[PDB]
Amino acid sequence: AMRLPDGTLQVMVEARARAQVTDYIPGPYLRARGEVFSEIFPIDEAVVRVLVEELKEAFEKYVANHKSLRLDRYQLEAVKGTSDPAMLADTIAYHATWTVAEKQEILELTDLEARLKKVLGLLSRDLERFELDKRVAQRVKEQMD
Amino acid sequence: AMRLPDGTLQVMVEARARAQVTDYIPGPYLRARGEVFSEIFPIDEAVVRVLVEELKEAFEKYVANHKSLRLDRYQLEAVKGTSDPAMLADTIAYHATWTVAEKQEILELTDLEARLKKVLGLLSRDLERFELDKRVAQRVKEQMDTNQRESYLREQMKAIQKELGGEDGLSDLEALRKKIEEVGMPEAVKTKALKELDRLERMQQGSPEATVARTYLD
C-alpha cells in the first residue's frame, strides 16, 4: 500500500477476479459493485484449456510476424503454468498489440466464452496484417530487383 | 413420505407395473380403481439389453455434451447399477425428459424397443444440433475476423491516402464510393461495380482512369 499525490502513481495491483458494472451511481465518487474475489472459472474447461493452448500457439506464430511492433512473452511465459485460462487469455491479449480499448474490453469481461474467441479473433487479424506485411515486404524485395 | 419445504407437495413412491382404468367418475379427484399388472417382459431380452446399453451410451454422451455447460454426471449412475432391463428401460425413459403426452404413449405401450429407438434418435439429433450450433458460432467468429481484416487493410489503404497525393479529392472518392455503395445496386450490377469501385481506388490525377471512373460510378 503506497499511493502518490502527484505524477504517475506507483501502486501494485493484482487482478484477483473479473467483474462488471451494474450499479449506475454517478461519480465522483463512483461506487460500482465488483464480483467475488474467487477467479471466474470456465464452463468447458477441458475444451477451454485446449483453446488457450492454441491461443498460445497463435500468438507464438504471431510474435515472429509482430516484430515491427513486438511485445514481450516474459510476463506471459512466467504465467503459462497458471491453471486459470482467463488470465492467460488476458495476458496473450495484452502482449499481442492491438486496440487498448479492445484489450480492456477483453480483460474486464468476466465470461471466457466471448473472451477466448475475441483474443483468437484479433490474433487472426494481427497474424493476417503482419503476413500481408510479409508478402508486401517480399514484393518490395522482388520489385526493387 | 417426507415434507421438503419448497411449496410443492410430493410423496416418495415405488411403482410396480401399469394398470387399466375401469372407472371414469369426474373429479378432482378421481375414484378409479387400478386393474391387474399389464407390464410384460419383452421377447428376446438379449437384444433388448443391447438396445438399453446403446441408449445408455447415447445418454452418457448426451450429458457429456452438456458437460460443456458444467452439468454433473448423476443420472447415469441412476440408470446404472441394475442388471435387469425392466427397471433399466424405465429409469432411462424417466431420466430422458419428454412431453407428458409422449410419456403417456410410453405408459400405454408395454414393449420397450420403440421407445429405446425413439429416445436414441432424438438424443442423436440433439447432439447434432448442439455441435452444429457451436461450429456455426466459431465459423461466424472467423468470418468476422476475415471482415475485420478487410476493414483494417482498408484503413491502412486510407491511412496512406493521408500524407500522400491529395486527401481532398481522394476523401471525395471514398465518400463518393460510399454513396455509390449505398444506392441500392442489383447484385450483378453491384459485383461488376465492385471491380470498377476498387479501380476507382486509383489516385485520381496520376491514374486518370479513376478520374473518368468518378464520372462513371457517379
Side-chain angles (χ1 to χ4, degrees), chain B residues 59-77:
Chain B
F59 183 55
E60 167 187 352
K61 291 303 187 283
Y62 180 68
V63 186
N65 200 1
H66 281 280
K67 211 164 184 54
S68 59
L69 273 297
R70 255 175 61 179
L71 182 55
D72 301 8
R73 326 291 303 265
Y74 282 83
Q75 294 194 355
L76 272 300
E77 303 175 358

Side-chain angles (χ1 to χ4, degrees), chain A residues 13-73:
Chain A
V13 307
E14 178 170 355
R16 307 301 291 172
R18 275 73 59 195
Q20 79 171 4
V21 192
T22 302
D23 305 328
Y24 291 101
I25 296 172
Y29 287 140
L30 197 155
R31 297 302 158 90
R33 59 95 174 173
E35 280 188 14
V36 288
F37 277 109
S38 173
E39 299 178 348
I40 185 64
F41 274 110
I43 304 96
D44 200 5
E45 319 193 7
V47 186
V48 170
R49 68 186 79 258
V50 181
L51 205 62
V52 168
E53 189 54 49
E54 62 88 23
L55 199 74
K56 292 182 181 94
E57 302 305 309
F59 181 44
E60 264 163 18
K61 207 258 169 188
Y62 175 53
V63 71
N65 293 309
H66 195 33
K67 289 300 185 189
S68 304
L69 317 175
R70 174 232 54 93
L71 278 195
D72 44 355
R73 208 171 284 269

Side-chain angles (χ1 to χ4, degrees), chain B residues 165-183:
Chain B
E167 181 65 26
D168 51 336
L170 272 296
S171 53
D172 168 48
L173 295 195
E174 303 292 331
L176 212 50
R177 86 182 277 267
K178 253 46 191 169
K179 297 147 204 160
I180 280 149
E181 290 153 12
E182 77 210 4
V183 185

Side-chain angles (χ1 to χ4, degrees), chain A residues 57-115:
Chain A
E57 302 305 309
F59 181 44
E60 264 163 18
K61 207 258 169 188
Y62 175 53
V63 71
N65 293 309
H66 195 33
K67 289 300 185 189
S68 304
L69 317 175
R70 174 232 54 93
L71 278 195
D72 44 355
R73 208 171 284 269
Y74 303 102
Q75 314 159 356
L76 179 52
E77 285 199 350
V79 302
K80 282 186 184 306
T82 315
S83 304
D84 184 29
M87 61 66 78
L88 294 174
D90 292 338
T91 300
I92 286 161
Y94 160 69
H95 281 144
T97 300
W98 53 68
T99 313
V100 63
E102 279 177 346
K103 282 188 193 186
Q104 284 158 315
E105 285 173 353
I106 277 156
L107 188 153
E108 290 181 347
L109 170 65
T110 304
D111 298 337
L112 283 78
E113 205 262 331
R115 157 167 43 231

Side-chain angles (χ1 to χ4, degrees), chain B residues 80-134:
Chain B
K80 284 158 187 174
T82 52
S83 302
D84 190 38
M87 311 76 78
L88 281 169
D90 292 1
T91 188
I92 290 176
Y94 162 68
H95 282 293
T97 66
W98 314 113
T99 51
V100 181
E102 294 175 357
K103 280 291 296 296
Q104 277 305 105
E105 297 160 4
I106 291 177
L107 178 60
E108 291 145 16
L109 294 174
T110 72
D111 55 337
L112 310 175
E113 292 273 318
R115 68 193 71 170
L116 284 157
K117 300 152 194 171
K118 158 186 170 294
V119 172
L120 188 153
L122 290 176
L123 288 186
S124 61
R125 169 213 60 182
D126 293 348
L127 298 172
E128 293 153 4
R129 293 180 318 183
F130 304 148
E131 294 170 347
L132 179 55
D133 292 347
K134 300 188 302 183

